[PDB]
Design a protein around this ligand. Structure first.
Ligand SMILES: */C(=C(/C#N)C(=O)NCC1(c2ccc(C(F)(F)F)cc2)CC1)c1ccccc1P(C)(C)=O
Length: 147
């Protein structure tokens, strides 16, 4: 459901911004996702560096416009795989760091608005593929957990 993906998206932004995580901590799926996405983001940032330097992410609306443009090119051939889904999280980690430097508004809670539209994109555009490929715990985790 939506609430599950919204939680993964918020946890990943929390990981990128190094904001503390209390108690129970992230679920095993969240921890596997954070480890994989952190490594993809390192590659993505280097490859998209010129694009990132060209843009002014002054607000959540600007971040959404840029996210929409990047998703349209990322999925141009129509194919979905776990690598491309991890790339969606890597891109939200990149947008939140741009917002941290360039956002005009003094609003720290903008990451929850970012997590929200990213999760609605993952659900609306890739939700049927995720359900066909085993879901998060029985598909994503099984593929990316250490053996
Ligand atoms: C980035 C392009 C190059 N080379 C490119 O690959 N465009 C793809 C595109 C995009 C949009 C926004 C971003 C990001 F927000 F991360 F910055 C990345 C990619 C879907 C459109 C680039 C490089 C140098 C100068 C301009 C650009 P733009 C942002 C005008 O495409």
């Amino acid at each position: 459901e939506f609430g599950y993906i919204y939680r993964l998206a918020q946890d990943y932004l929390q990981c990128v911004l190094q904001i503390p995580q209390p108690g129970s901590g992230p679920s095993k799926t969240s921890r596997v996702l954070q480890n994989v996405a952190f490594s993809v983001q390192k590659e993505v940032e280097k490859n998209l560096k010129s694009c990132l330097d060209n843009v002014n992410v002054v607000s959540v609306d600007t971040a959404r416009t840029l996210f929409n443009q990047v998703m349209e090119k990322e999925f141009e051939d129509g194919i979905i795989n776990w690598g491309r889904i991890v790339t969606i999280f890597a891109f939200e980690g990149i947008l939140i760091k741009k917002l941290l430097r360039q956002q005009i508004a003094p609003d720290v809670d903008t990451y929850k608005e970012i997590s929200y539209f990213v999760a609605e994109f993952i659900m609306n555009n890739t939700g049927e593929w995720i359900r066909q490929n085993g879901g998060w715990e029985n598909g994503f985790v099984k593929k990316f957990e250490p053996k």
